[PDB]
Amino acid sequence: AVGIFVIIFGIALFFLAMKVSGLVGTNLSDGYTMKAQFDNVNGLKPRAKVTMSGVTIGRVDSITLDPVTRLATVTFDLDGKLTSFNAEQLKEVQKNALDELRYSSDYTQATPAQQKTMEQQLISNMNSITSIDEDAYIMVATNGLLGEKYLKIVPGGGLNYLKRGDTISNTQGTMDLEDLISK
Amino acid sequence: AVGIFVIIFGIALFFLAMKVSGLVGTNLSDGYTMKAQFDNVNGLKPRAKVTMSGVTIGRVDSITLDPVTRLATVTFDLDGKLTSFNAEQLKEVQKNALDELRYSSDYTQATPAQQKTMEQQLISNMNSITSIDEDAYIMVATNGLLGEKYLKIVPGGGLNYLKRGDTISNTQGTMDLEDLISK
Amino acid sequence: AVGIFVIIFGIALFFLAMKVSGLVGTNLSDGYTMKAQFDNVNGLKPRAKVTMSGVTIGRVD
Amino acid sequence: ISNMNSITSIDEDAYIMVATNGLLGEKYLKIVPGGGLNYLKRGDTISNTQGTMDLEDLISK
Amino acid sequence: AVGIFVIIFGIALFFLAMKVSGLVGTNLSDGYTMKAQFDNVNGLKPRAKVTMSGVTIGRVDSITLDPVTRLATVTFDLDGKLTSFNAEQLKEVQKNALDELRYSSDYTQATPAQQKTMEQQLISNMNSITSIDEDAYIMVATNGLLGEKYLKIVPGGGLNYLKRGDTISNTQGTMDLEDLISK
Amino acid sequence: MNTIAWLGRLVIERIRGIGVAALMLLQIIFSLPSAGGFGRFVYQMHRVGVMSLLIITVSGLFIGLVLGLQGYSILVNVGSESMLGTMVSLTLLRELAPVVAALLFAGRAGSALTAEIGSMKQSEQLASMEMIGVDPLKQIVSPRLWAGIVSLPMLTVIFAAIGIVGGKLVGVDFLGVDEGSFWSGMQNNVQFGHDVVNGIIKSIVFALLCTWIAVFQGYACDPTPEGIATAMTRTVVYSSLCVLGFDFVLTAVMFGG
Amino acid sequence: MNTIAWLGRLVIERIRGIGVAALMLLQIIFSLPSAGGFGRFVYQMHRVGVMSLLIITVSGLFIGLVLGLQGYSILVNVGSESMLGTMVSLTLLRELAPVVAALLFAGRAGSALTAEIGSMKQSEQLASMEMIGVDPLKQIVSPRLWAGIVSLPMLTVIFAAIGIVGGKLVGVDFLGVDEGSFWSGMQNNVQFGHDVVNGIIKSIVFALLCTWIAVFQGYACDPTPEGIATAMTRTVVYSSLCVLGFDFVLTAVMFGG
């Protein structure tokens, strides 16, 4: 009791979320929630975009405070569909992380019992390797040229891997260029 | 009328709940209208962002002027539903405040009669931690190019609840750099 | 029972249609005038704002 | 008589300066009230402090 | 066979066209046709506003070009804030012009017959005094910060008055400074 | 403005049987120009006028409140140079509101008129009177045509005018927008005395469309109730493109877009 | 966003389109509304589906192109700060198209629905069948309430989708803009493919509201030609501005505004 173009128009609409919704959509299935401290940011709002190396990876989840020192505690919505090191790359990480542990001066002079815990550290990496590494650098950049801040992660070089529940140390979320000039 | 006009119930039920859902909230228990004195701020708009350590906590209500003395009493719509200490943590805060009260030689080995007014002072110190903060500092900063002012707050200590009309310490309410440009 | 709400909404909007061009308005019932001479004001528009200590208290007539 | 007719009402003799509100133009005329005689209204003179010598136009030619 | 408020709302709309169309209009009744040659003006449209110390004084009547001499011919339409002079104000500046004619050394050494035609000049130029002085200053100003090119004419001090048919001397409307910046 | 005229050629397209009533619309004051408040004459005036007063106030609150949040979000997204009613009342009075007004008059009241005329042929007047030879044009066109077109082009503009008069009521209730800056801003944004004065003409043309389209389909309907709903379907098809052809041309020419 | 609830209460303020026969609608819900491909379904989908197919393809394209002229005039005036589909698709899908789409169902299909039931009360069905005792609610209303939410709210999204299809048709004709940069530039600015597919919920409640008002005017009419034509003029009084209760409620959630 309908025409043939009902369906055709419906299929045309279904084509628009074939690849779009896989990238951009839902909320907990493709993200990890992590925290970091900030001291004073001139223009940050909840759901402001977050980047890594100039590429948007997600957004701010929510913004709360820390009463003790009266500073900001920002929860992040980071890219969790990007596994980064996946199970095929895990095979390389098991040998690359072990060689960094093996030839270090803190483990070559260690008690043999302690040398056997280098592979125990691999196990702890295996269950925490989806996402990003240990040493990350968080700073406040801008989105456009006017105002509106844009938060940025610059991967460093560490030993462990981080996931949801872990905290990244603040690198540069304090300096306002207006206060730099005026004080 | 239960019939013909039956749906008076459906008219009466939603018309006034939706009305107050848009209009208010309320912010009578979740907000207070505190005031502060400014001397020369070029461009303060109603509903402009009022922040604390970068985070917006309220907005501009309205401004009361005095031509004779050339002063402006700016009323702020500040939220009172912000972060705070729990019972054990707040106890540690007033113990630290008590150590500042007992630092002076007058109240170090205090007479129990005098300790009663020092505990009244601890109550006074707890009142401004989260709800109606009296002892704080205010300075005007900018989000955008010049306009789109961003007001900042640097909390100090605590002194009971702030009264309406009682000014907040003015650090920088003279936002006018035309003489800087000219000289 | 329609005239009940003419009054509530109809005359309320009648008052607001009169208060468009004749807001203050025709005879300057709530304001006063000031005069001054200028030689160069690039950017002063008719209906530009006039202030005191950064707070608007008037406008250009 | 001079004392009685020099203290009534908001003050008359105000001083003015030309500058913008935001960054664009829309010159926001500043007022710094001084000390005059009567209520400030029609028949009173505003003193021009800064609305003549624009230095930016001299630079731009 | 009609209502009441139809008409009332139509009267309110008349008062809104009165203010705009009463302001903006006429074209040879409150001004005179004068020309000026321009070498480079960015974006001057027909009926674009012409200003003076930030005050609109007229508009562009029409704009044409002559590539033989490579200059643009603009005709002007002054608005109705000044028509030019009243009856006694016209007589006042004729007496001031007569004093300039009488004080000048060209007319004190003139034939007495020629001295008697100093007022004949004012009679013959009674409708040519309209309105501004002979020597007027040309430049292009802005309504925004760069763009919104706003043509500005500020009368200076000449010998006679600028009358119809005259060409306004171009002071500062030829200097394109982009080549100065880039070379 | 050629592409605009290219798209704006719909004013000629939707004229199927309408053009037969050419000299029929001419001869409506042939047999004595009547005027006054009559039984059906005033009821058409209720449909066009009295009832529409409530439609105008409430649809203005629907439009106004939707574009009131838009006004706020432009400040947030684009900036302070096009905030609030700088770039919203600009498009609302001038180009946007006029389309909806035509749909709620040329569409709604036009078809309603037709529906009543159709029933004269089926039952009450023309059924007996055409057969006798009592002047058909004087019978049903002359006393019903004029009823729905005298206040109509004023009302089309009033639709949009009330969005500005009520726009400052809710500009204040949603945020606090000053009424006088809204008012003086409005005038300057559209250059009212030259552009919106010419938008009155655009709405007279919309009234003139009602005189061609509505009359013929009521005049020669089939006297069945299904033929009447087919005749109302035809008036929605005719009025929907005639208005849009002029939305192209007269926005570019009367307003100057 | 204080305008979310303020749009809702406008609909709630006056409900006389539903109220008189609300008890009959509640009885259908009680007794359990019918479903299935019947003869009623065929004519309900004629009015909603088949007729609208040509209206949406032809008038729906030019409606969108008039709103794209508004889009073009921003490019002419502002340019670079509102380029391509920054301020075009933004208000079109979410705010503008929805009301005009409602006038083709709350208005046009609603009027047709009224006309059918009123005339079957006078002739073909309910004139005899009420008296026989073949339950009137189960007979003609119960399966056509269910029919209202099948094709009708998809068609409101398709109506709006045609505006986007028309946007790339004249991206070159108004100026010379490559269709692929217009559309993908647009896509990025409003997150188009994700939000437009999620926003198919907005008008499901509106489908229900259209049929609760329009059925009453046909169902409880006086089956005479004067009573039926009065009820058809009463249909557009109540159905026109009581179908916009959930605009920003689901625009904020499904369209992601």
Author numbering:
A (entry chain C), B (entry chain D), E (entry chain F): 9 to 191
C (entry chain E): 9 to 69
D (entry chain E): 131 to 191
F (entry chain H), G (entry chain G): 1 to 257
Q: What did the study's authors say about this model?
A:
We performed a genetic screen to identify genes important for the OM barrier of A. baumannii. This led to the identification of an ABC (ATP-binding cassette) transporter complex that promotes GPL export to the OM. The A. baumannii operon includes: mlaF and mlaE, respectively predicted to encode the nucleotide-binding and transmembrane domains of an ABC transporter; mlaD, encoding a protein containing an IM-spanning domain and a predicted periplasmic soluble domain; mlaC, encoding a soluble periplasmic protein; and mlaB, an additional gene predicted to encode a cytoplasmic sulfate transporter and anti-sigma factor antiagonist (STAS)-domain protein. The results of the stable isotope pulse experiments in the ∆mlaA strain revealed results consistent with those obtained from ∆mlaC and ∆mlaF, in which the ratio of labeled to unlabeled GPL is consistently higher in the inner membrane than the outer membrane after one hour of exposure to 13C-acetate. These results are consistent with a model in which the IM-localized ABC transporter complex MlaBDEF first transfers GPLs to the periplasmic binding protein MlaC, which then transports GPL to the OM, whereupon MlaA facilitates GPL insertion into the OM. According to this model, ATP hydrolysis by MlaF provides the initial energy to extract GPL from the IM, while the substrate binding components MlaD and MlaC take up lipids for delivery to the OM.
We next used cryo-electron microscopy to characterize the architecture of the A. baumannii MlaBDEF complex (abMlaBDEF). Following 2D- and 3D-classification, we obtained a final dataset of ~14,000 particles with which we obtained a structure to a resolution of 8.7 Å. Based on the bioinformatically-predicted localization of individual proteins and work recently performed on the similar E. coli Mla complex (ecMlaBDEF), we propose that MlaD localizes to the periplasmic side of the IM, MlaE forms the central transmembrane region, and MlaF and MlaB form the bottom layer on the cytoplasmic face of the IM with two visible hetero-dimers. We note that a clear six-fold symmetry is present for the region of the map attributed to MlaD, despite the fact that we only imposed a 2-fold symmetry averaging. We next modeled abMlaD, using an evolution restraints-derived structural model of ecMlaD as a template, and used our previously-published EM-guided symmetry modeling procedure to model its hexameric state. The localization of this extra density suggests that it corresponds to a ~ 45 amino-acid insert present between strands 4 and 5 of the abMlaD β-sheet. Interestingly, the arrangement of MlaF clearly resembles the pre-translocation state of MalK. The resulting MlaE dimer model fits well to the EM map density, and clearly corresponds to a closed transporter, with no solvent channel between the subunits. Interestingly, we also noted clear density for three TM helices that likely correspond to the MlaD N-terminal helices.
